[model samples]
Target: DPMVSKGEELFTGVVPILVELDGDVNGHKFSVSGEGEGDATYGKLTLKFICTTGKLPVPWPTLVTTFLMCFARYPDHMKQHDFFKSAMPEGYVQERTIFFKDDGNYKTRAEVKFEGDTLVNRIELKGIDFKEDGNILGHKLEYNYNSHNVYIMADKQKNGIKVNFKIRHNIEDGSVQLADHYQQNTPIGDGPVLLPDNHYLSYQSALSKDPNEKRDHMVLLEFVTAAGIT
Candidate 1:
């Protein structure tokens, strides 16, 4: 369980710190590059973050705030100084809240749980703060088992508009989760996978033929388990 504990520790402390210093780390000195191969087209995306100050080391607050703003659905003015004050239990200050955010439109809210030693469970999203229009814009739930593996199930409904996505991954091996036992070796990462991506394309292609199709729906499932490193 050390791996799980380590993951929790990093998420709570180091991750926040990294996020605060994202500008510096990702600045001119640091760079990000990604590429994908499929079909006849090859795609790549690259981004660079340049910092005005030379090698500015951002604090935990800066990193956490930046991370939440980028990934988590929340308002820029959302107060976070005390947001994580009670994130952990007493005497367990070392523990961290890996995930926390207000749902779409700052309505529904959730926080990831990492208390147990071995098995981790996916908890429900609580504390919904609905907008004046009484619409929920975003909602999602995710859980991690091993340090490098995760299973996520999420749905977002915004004023009767909805979209959903699911992902499973082996962060260490960069593999995708699949249903077929033979295809279990498929690779997945912090990005999209083939099977799900193809399924979406096919579904959309079929829907294009029938304009009367009114069911706004989306669903995805992935599975991955491997013991060797690539």
Candidate 2:
């Protein structure tokens, strides 16, 4: 009922999450990584979130405004969840426990909580809903931490979608492991399972004439010619 039309504003900040594992949790075996580079301040503008998500255009390869958000889940091939960017040292419920392959026995766990800063999350799968999870799924989700701006409403016979997100990270130095730096030099692929085979028309010839650099161009032309990436 909301493709958005009210005050008209739907910025991207990426807070998507889907979880698994209602069958195991052996004991202990963990590895969680990180990195932080603060500089956020472009607040006051909010709503229409899903904690569950897109976009593309003929321009924008750099000079966007900083964002590498894929909070978790969306990988392929038996699932994988490892591609991150800073700020989670403080939590209400931030979890990760993967060691589900090659003689570590078997382990799995995933979580994300946001009831205070705004990205109000709640995707308790393993109980099932957003289909699956592990990491990376996107075409649009960029924001330098707009102090956590989010809003989502769901009622598909009451199955999913309900998150009011909010985040504000401030750090000038940090590192946390689990890495991915997109083509290394920069083709700007921040991983949401690497965006459906580098779609979004392969980023329109890497456009950058820099005339204020603004892009939304009808939500990246309806997110890859009609949004439908698994």
Candidate 3:
């Protein structure tokens, strides 16, 4: 009974998670907020990622774009794992934790692990699959939830470099109801699924406009729970 009460005390309520990605390259920042049930960690958490990175640079950068795209192109060994750590802004690292309130404030209901040069926000939830009903471009499509990896990373676009974000399904278990002919090998959004916005990825274009331009770029993702504050 004591353990049960402590669990309830720890996770009292659910709220939305807002993630921000600040780039050192241009001092420009991008943000994304959870939407639908995905934003709130109450009940079953679906895979719905909404970007709050309003107002991108005119003619989006060669590599800077939506988070959906970044997750799509990071399969090569050269761009895997430690790219973000190497690109992080020099001498900038910190941890964040917030206390709960009934007046609507951010609460972080998860475990924090700091190792080497990375900070990890880990959350464990029982994932349940459900029917997805929504209007996509005025077309109502029904897709079942199997949970996917929603992440962001940086890479080059042909000659120019930039960053992107993407959502891809984890390993197929024959339960996903996609078309039979659907073939994808990149595993962009596959498992082991990285915590929504807890992981960071960085890259700098090989081609720079000037010699002084800081080609190295880094992004940090922060998640906080806020009631009625999506």
Candidate 4:
């Protein structure tokens, strides 16, 4: 949660000033850090940003006004991923990691690695689900990269059931591309009950929604500078 902590420090100090000046402020802060490997032949740059408010307000006025004033000077800054992608050289290797914490629920960890014009590797998420009395439910999901997309598989199963999910990156931003999922129902008494049809239907329905629908409203800002890395 260091990113979030840093974000809070940035917001409290900058937000009020911009508002007082009758300027708009987007509630996000980004930081970048990196280390090189093998005599600087292999290097990594990390970019991370946070949002003060979780979701954007509807009707667009508040969001548009705020984001415009805060980011109007740098349109490219609005696309954090793209900024990182362009900032680093084609052969430069950079890793981006994001961690999100939700109150009393779970924590999410996401990481991505970029090389050349493609994403060489990525680890999308790691979550912890809990039960009452602070017991672990053992329901955790993980994703790994094989090629252009992420292939997901389950590690722990319960109630004689298991689930699997797959995700891909958007061609433009290399964000979440699409999700393909499957569920297996292995009833102890029923002797390996398979539900391939049900799994396909459910996953397909979930993937029907547009992944980039709300992307335009997102505000991304980077505090790092790219120098002689192009």
The local distance difference test score of model 3 is 0.23
Per-residue C-alpha lDDT of model 1 across residues 8-105, encoded as one tens digit per residue: 24233212111112122212232111111111011111111223334322211111111111111112122121111112211111111212222111
Candidate 3 global TM-score:
0.21
Clashing residue pairs, backbone N/CA/C < 3 A, model 4:
168-177
Best-to-worst order by lDDT is 3, 4, 2, 1
Maximum-lDDT candidate: 3
Provide the overall lDDT of each model, using Cα atoms, as 2-decimal numbers: 0.19, 0.20, 0.23, 0.21
Model 1 residue 64 lDDT? 13
Off by over 4 Å in 4: 1-83, 86-106, 129-230
RMSD of each: 23.4, 19.0, 20.7, 22.6
lDDT of 4 at 55: 33
Count of clashes in candidate 2: 25
Task: Evaluate residue 173 in candidate 2 and report its C-alpha lDDT on the 0 to 100 scale.
Answer: 32
lDDT of 4 by residue, 144-203 (tens): 222221121222243222334343423223433233433232222322211211111111
**lDDT per residue as tens, model 3, 1-230:** 33223222322343232223332112334433322211112222222332345542211111121211111122223222322212221211221221111111111222222233233323211111212221211122222222222232322322111222332212224321221111111221122211122233332211112335242322322232211111
Q: Which stretches of candidate 2 lie over 4 Å from their true place?
A: 1-102, 118-230
* Best of the candidates, TM-score: 3
